[PDB]
Design a protein around this ligand. Structure first.
Ligand SMILES: [Fe+2]
Length: 187
Protein backbone atom coordinates (compact mmCIF):
# COMPACT_ATOMS: atom_id res chain seq x y z
CA UNK A 1 0.00 0.00 0.00
CA UNK A 2 3.09 2.22 -0.13
CA UNK A 3 2.70 5.14 -2.52
CA UNK A 4 5.12 4.33 -5.34
CA UNK A 5 6.68 7.25 -7.24
CA UNK A 6 7.06 6.34 -10.92
CA UNK A 7 9.70 9.03 -11.55
CA UNK A 8 12.16 11.09 -9.55
CA UNK A 9 9.95 14.09 -10.32
CA UNK A 10 7.04 12.20 -8.70
CA UNK A 11 9.19 11.44 -5.67
CA UNK A 12 10.19 15.09 -5.29
CA UNK A 13 6.53 16.13 -5.53
CA UNK A 14 5.59 13.66 -2.78
CA UNK A 15 8.47 14.80 -0.59
CA UNK A 16 7.30 18.41 -0.85
CA UNK A 17 3.97 17.26 0.60
CA UNK A 18 5.41 15.04 3.32
CA UNK A 19 7.70 17.79 4.66
CA UNK A 20 5.15 20.57 4.28
CA UNK A 21 3.92 20.18 7.85
CA UNK A 22 5.49 20.14 11.28
CA UNK A 23 5.75 16.36 11.72
CA UNK A 24 7.59 13.91 9.50
CA UNK A 25 6.78 10.22 9.61
CA UNK A 26 10.27 8.77 9.18
CA UNK A 27 9.08 5.28 8.29
CA UNK A 28 6.63 6.66 5.71
CA UNK A 29 9.27 8.83 4.01
CA UNK A 30 11.72 5.94 4.04
CA UNK A 31 9.23 3.54 2.43
CA UNK A 32 8.32 5.99 -0.34
CA UNK A 33 11.96 6.76 -1.12
CA UNK A 34 12.71 3.03 -1.22
CA UNK A 35 9.71 2.46 -3.52
CA UNK A 36 11.07 4.78 -6.21
CA UNK A 37 12.89 2.50 -8.67
CA UNK A 38 16.16 4.21 -9.54
CA UNK A 39 16.15 5.20 -13.21
CA UNK A 40 19.50 6.56 -14.44
CA UNK A 41 17.84 8.39 -17.32
CA UNK A 42 16.12 10.59 -14.75
CA UNK A 43 19.14 11.51 -12.61
CA UNK A 44 22.16 11.30 -14.94
CA UNK A 45 22.23 15.09 -15.22
CA UNK A 46 23.16 15.23 -11.51
CA UNK A 47 25.74 12.42 -11.64
CA UNK A 48 28.92 14.48 -11.93
CA UNK A 49 31.97 12.54 -10.71
CA UNK A 50 35.44 13.58 -9.59
CA UNK A 51 38.60 11.49 -9.80
CA UNK A 52 39.72 11.80 -6.18
CA UNK A 53 36.70 12.12 -3.91
CA UNK A 54 32.95 11.91 -3.88
CA UNK A 55 30.85 14.81 -5.08
CA UNK A 56 27.72 16.39 -3.62
CA UNK A 57 25.16 17.50 -6.24
CA UNK A 58 22.11 19.50 -5.21
CA UNK A 59 18.81 18.42 -6.75
CA UNK A 60 16.10 20.25 -4.80
CA UNK A 61 15.73 22.65 -1.87
CA UNK A 62 12.36 21.41 -0.65
CA UNK A 63 10.85 24.87 -0.14
CA UNK A 64 13.41 25.29 2.64
CA UNK A 65 12.26 22.15 4.44
CA UNK A 66 15.01 19.84 3.17
CA UNK A 67 17.98 19.50 0.85
CA UNK A 68 17.78 16.68 -1.69
CA UNK A 69 21.12 15.84 -3.25
CA UNK A 70 22.89 13.12 -5.19
CA UNK A 71 26.32 11.91 -4.07
CA UNK A 72 28.59 10.32 -6.65
CA UNK A 73 31.15 7.85 -5.28
CA UNK A 74 34.01 7.01 -7.63
CA UNK A 75 35.86 3.68 -7.37
CA UNK A 76 36.83 3.13 -3.76
CA UNK A 77 35.54 6.53 -2.57
CA UNK A 78 34.28 6.91 0.99
CA UNK A 79 33.31 9.51 3.59
CA UNK A 80 34.72 10.48 6.92
CA UNK A 81 33.07 9.36 10.14
CA UNK A 82 30.63 12.20 10.59
CA UNK A 83 27.51 13.43 12.35
CA UNK A 84 24.38 15.02 10.89
CA UNK A 85 23.90 18.31 12.76
CA UNK A 86 20.60 17.39 14.43
CA UNK A 87 18.75 16.69 11.15
CA UNK A 88 16.78 13.74 9.78
CA UNK A 89 18.98 12.06 7.17
CA UNK A 90 17.72 9.62 4.53
CA UNK A 91 20.09 7.80 2.16
CA UNK A 92 18.81 5.81 -0.83
CA UNK A 93 20.95 3.80 -3.25
CA UNK A 94 20.58 4.80 -6.90
CA UNK A 95 23.47 2.76 -8.35
CA UNK A 96 26.05 0.37 -6.92
CA UNK A 97 26.37 -0.28 -3.19
CA UNK A 98 27.64 1.58 -0.13
CA UNK A 99 28.85 0.00 3.08
CA UNK A 100 27.50 1.89 6.09
CA UNK A 101 29.45 1.59 9.36
CA UNK A 102 27.68 3.01 12.42
CA UNK A 103 29.90 4.35 15.21
CA UNK A 104 29.25 5.20 18.82
CA UNK A 105 29.84 8.78 19.89
CA UNK A 106 33.21 9.47 21.55
CA UNK A 107 33.51 10.92 25.01
CA UNK A 108 36.15 13.53 25.86
CA UNK A 109 38.87 10.95 26.55
CA UNK A 110 40.95 9.92 23.54
CA UNK A 111 40.17 6.37 22.36
CA UNK A 112 39.73 4.19 19.30
CA UNK A 113 36.17 4.60 18.09
CA UNK A 114 33.64 1.82 18.60
CA UNK A 115 31.69 0.26 15.73
CA UNK A 116 28.04 -0.42 16.51
CA UNK A 117 26.82 -1.81 13.19
CA UNK A 118 28.06 -2.57 9.69
CA UNK A 119 25.97 -3.33 6.60
CA UNK A 120 25.83 -3.03 2.81
CA UNK A 121 22.97 -0.99 1.38
CA UNK A 122 21.20 -2.96 -1.35
CA UNK A 123 19.78 -1.81 -4.67
CA UNK A 124 17.15 0.92 -4.14
CA UNK A 125 17.38 0.57 -0.33
CA UNK A 126 16.73 3.67 1.80
CA UNK A 127 18.57 3.93 5.13
CA UNK A 128 17.99 6.48 7.88
CA UNK A 129 20.21 8.16 10.47
CA UNK A 130 20.17 10.98 12.97
CA UNK A 131 22.57 11.97 15.73
CA UNK A 132 20.64 9.93 18.31
CA UNK A 133 21.21 6.82 16.21
CA UNK A 134 24.97 7.33 16.03
CA UNK A 135 27.75 8.52 13.73
CA UNK A 136 28.52 6.85 10.48
CA UNK A 137 30.91 6.35 7.61
CA UNK A 138 29.80 5.26 4.14
CA UNK A 139 31.99 3.95 1.38
CA UNK A 140 31.72 2.46 -2.06
CA UNK A 141 32.20 -1.30 -1.72
CA UNK A 142 33.64 -1.48 -5.22
CA UNK A 143 37.03 -0.55 -6.64
CA UNK A 144 35.82 -1.19 -10.21
CA UNK A 145 32.33 0.37 -10.26
CA UNK A 146 30.87 3.64 -8.98
CA UNK A 147 28.08 4.13 -6.49
CA UNK A 148 25.39 6.81 -6.55
CA UNK A 149 23.17 7.75 -3.63
CA UNK A 150 20.23 10.08 -3.02
CA UNK A 151 20.32 11.99 0.28
CA UNK A 152 17.52 13.91 1.94
CA UNK A 153 18.45 16.03 4.95
CA UNK A 154 15.82 17.84 6.96
CA UNK A 155 16.28 20.53 8.07
CA UNK A 156 19.03 21.45 5.60
CA UNK A 157 22.48 21.97 7.05
CA UNK A 158 25.84 23.09 5.70
CA UNK A 159 28.30 22.06 8.43
CA UNK A 160 29.00 18.88 10.36
CA UNK A 161 31.87 17.28 12.26
CA UNK A 162 34.34 14.68 11.03
CA UNK A 163 35.82 12.26 13.60
CA UNK A 164 39.26 10.63 13.79
CA UNK A 165 38.71 6.89 14.13
CA UNK A 166 41.94 6.52 16.16
CA UNK A 167 41.06 9.06 18.86
CA UNK A 168 37.45 10.27 18.59
CA UNK A 169 38.64 13.86 18.19
CA UNK A 170 36.52 15.89 15.82
CA UNK A 171 36.87 18.81 13.42
CA UNK A 172 34.15 21.02 11.98
CA UNK A 173 33.70 20.64 8.22
CA UNK A 174 31.87 22.97 5.85
CA UNK A 175 30.17 20.95 3.14
CA UNK A 176 30.34 22.23 -0.42
CA UNK A 177 28.37 21.41 -3.54
CA UNK A 178 30.05 20.20 -6.71
CA UNK A 179 26.97 21.18 -8.71
CA UNK A 180 23.48 22.59 -8.18
CA UNK A 181 20.47 21.77 -10.39
CA UNK A 182 22.82 20.08 -12.85
CA UNK A 183 25.16 23.09 -13.09
CA UNK A 184 28.77 22.95 -11.90
CA UNK A 185 29.56 25.33 -9.02
CA UNK A 186 32.51 27.77 -9.26
CA UNK A 187 34.95 25.60 -7.23
FE1 LIG B 1 26.07 10.80 6.50
Amino acid sequence: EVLKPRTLADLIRILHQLFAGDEVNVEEVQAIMEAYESDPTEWAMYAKFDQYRYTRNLVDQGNGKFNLMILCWGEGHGSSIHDHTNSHCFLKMLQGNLKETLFAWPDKKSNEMVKKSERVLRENQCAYINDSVGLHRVENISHTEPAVSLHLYSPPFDTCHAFDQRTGHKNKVTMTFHSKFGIRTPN
